[PDB]
Design a protein around this ligand. Sequence first.
Ligand SMILES: [Mg+2]
Ligand SMILES: [Mg+2]
Ligand SMILES: [Mg+2]
Ligand SMILES: [Mg+2]
Ligand SMILES: [Mg+2]
Ligand SMILES: [Mg+2]
Ligand SMILES: [Mg+2]
Ligand SMILES: [Mg+2]
Ligand SMILES: [Mg+2]
Ligand SMILES: [Mg+2]
Ligand SMILES: [Mg+2]
Ligand SMILES: [Mg+2]
Lengths: 116, 59, 100, 131, 60
Amino acid sequence: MKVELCSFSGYKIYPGHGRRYARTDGKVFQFLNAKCESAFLSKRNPRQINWTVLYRRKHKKGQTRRAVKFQRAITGASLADIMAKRNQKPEVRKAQREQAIRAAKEAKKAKQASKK
Amino acid sequence: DIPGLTDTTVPRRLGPKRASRIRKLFNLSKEDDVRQYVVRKPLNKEGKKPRTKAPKIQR
Amino acid sequence: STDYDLSDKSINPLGGFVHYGEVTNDFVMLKGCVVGTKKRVLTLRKSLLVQTKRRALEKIDLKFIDTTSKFGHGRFQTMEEKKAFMGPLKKDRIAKEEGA
Amino acid sequence: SGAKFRISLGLPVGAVINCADNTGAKNLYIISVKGIKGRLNRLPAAGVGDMVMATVKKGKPELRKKVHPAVVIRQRKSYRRKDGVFLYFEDNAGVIVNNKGEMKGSAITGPVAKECADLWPRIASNAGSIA
Amino acid sequence: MKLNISFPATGCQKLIEVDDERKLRTFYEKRMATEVAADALGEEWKGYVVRISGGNDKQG
RNA sequence: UCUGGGUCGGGGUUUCGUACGUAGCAGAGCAGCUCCCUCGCUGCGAUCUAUUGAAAGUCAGCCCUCGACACAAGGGUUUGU
RNA sequence: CAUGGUAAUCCUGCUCAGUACGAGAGGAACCGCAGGUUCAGACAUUUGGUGUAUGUGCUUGGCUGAGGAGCCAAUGGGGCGA
RNA sequence: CGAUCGCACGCCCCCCGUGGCGGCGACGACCCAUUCGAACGUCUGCCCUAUCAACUUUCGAUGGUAGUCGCCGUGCCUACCAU
RNA sequence: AACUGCGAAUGGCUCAUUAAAUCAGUUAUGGUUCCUUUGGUCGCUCGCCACUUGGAUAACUGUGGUAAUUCUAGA
Ligand SMILES: [Mg+2]
Ligand SMILES: [Mg+2]
Ligand SMILES: [Mg+2]
Ligand SMILES: [Mg+2]
Ligand SMILES: [Mg+2]
Ligand SMILES: [Mg+2]
Ligand SMILES: [Mg+2]
Ligand SMILES: [Mg+2]
Ligand SMILES: [Mg+2]
Ligand SMILES: [Mg+2]
Ligand SMILES: [Mg+2]
Ligand SMILES: [Mg+2]
């Protein structure tokens, strides 16, 4: 019930089995048996050996999304504040638009009067 | 509710700055009092007179 | 089955004990090696001494008992583990063909 | 604390192993092992973590014809690490130390066995990786 | 071990120190950006699913 | 004996490493047939791919069979307070 | 069970303890703990060795008309191997 | 094949009445030219030494052909040739 | 403060390398590139946002890790 290791052949090596190979360049390899360690030490490619799991995988042998926006209060305008601002649909927005229209009209008339 | 974690909602330090983002937040369609629908942040320090600061809108 | 294993497996290795048979009755699992061949009768005796060292009187709690095949280089613990790893074979394919 | 368990030795007297430090020596020829009481006809032998006396055969002249204490850090003989792993390295290698177990060099090339590392803290410091 | 617990819907992140390894064993052997149930953190965390966003090693 | 032990067979385990045959518009190329064909169609060709973790062995001192087959109340020499 | 044989040995580390002692420098021991050396008696789960299971691939020369399947070369050679 | 920024601000008003127009710039650009250059080449020129007289050419040495690469010309590199 | 832009390839130092090499004078690039400055070009193309489109991150608030660095994570 230790850490579970994998081999040259990709097989599972249970505790008390096989040998661990520590190369001089720092790489550490573990093998299930001397058949696997001889193939590795002879520089044999595991993808060309039919019982290796790398071969059976190379040859294919045998085999969320969301977008949630959470509303939050901000400094100066609470959640109720922004709700009251965004719920100005029933003719309040039109009233603001028409008062802006008349403000622009009176500003333009004042500008014409001042220029002339 | 977890004590002090899932409750007592804290506010964002500052609201939208791009006029498109203000309109998106407040459901503005087009050309309705946009410069006065911006959120004004109130500064109310004890040692100074209180006032409210408005951000410079962009685009 | 240890409490760290929780596998429905017996002490018998995959393929049975080599040169003995299948263990079905009670058994005693002793640390280390024991004189005699396989299926040799052994006499177990209470200690004549008083066990006072720390090697004795120590609670042995097993985390895992190996049950790989001893008839070679076994690499699987149970029949079901072997079947799950290795998938269907030709024998099982023709057996399922016959079963239909 | 903790005492080093017995391991397979595999390096008798007369073995020439690599010298993994930057001291300037290329190899160490083992002439004896520390702590070996001995037996008739039996060659003293050392594993990883063992302190040997060695002479360097290839290396600098100021090192060459002299006896140096050394510590074995990698062995090619497989040894069992009390947890069922049988570990061996690609080559036999050691480093040159003084009588206090302090390295003459300042760096180690390649891995250092755990048995040697925890037994010699000074070598563990200069070790690159621990295997 | 410490846990930097953050609830983005309300902010208010806070640190919870957890010592019992039985609480952390449900977190162990997982990866980042994975959602796990925090029910092993006592009854107070029942009904909570939390995503492992990150962390810092023993050396920082 | 509420049977027994054998001999084959089966299953398991395990060892090696993917059988013969067949098929392929896989294949360095080369050689024959062109009312043809409009890129052909016939071969030779190590090797490759699929069938195929296949084929083969496995107690003789491996494990389990309750399948098949016959055989087993037979023989000889002795032994008494 | 008469009788005969007879077996275990030594060292290191931690702690004791920077302690006793000592002006200082230096510097122990008993208990306990963890391991080694030499020896002994076993054993084969594991690692290694062997390997003519002459088990299974590969391969040289020859031979059976070829294929297939094999064999001979005093164990043909070689890989892996219960 | 400008979704940029500043400065004082002004003209047209029929259609009207809120829009359309304007100057000075700053920043930005595909390309061309210039400036600064850079890079590689042309010709000629260097100390002692023959107790250094033959070098280079397998592994580019000299040249050709077609390419690769490079900002570009070129054995810079590759393949095939010539020696 | 931070993002963006530019500069950091200049200057300064030393003379180890280097003998048709560097370098000096001469000439060429019709065999190449060139920030910046300056001058040209920016309605030259027929082809339900344009009164202006989308998203993220800084800075910033807050929770930290590490003995340590001009180290940085999550929100
Ligand atoms: Mg702007
Ligand atoms: Mg076995
Ligand atoms: Mg002798
Ligand atoms: Mg059988
Ligand atoms: Mg006696
Ligand atoms: Mg004795
Ligand atoms: Mg032959
Ligand atoms: Mg044949
Ligand atoms: Mg013959
Ligand atoms: Mg002969
Ligand atoms: Mg072998
Ligand atoms: Mg010089």
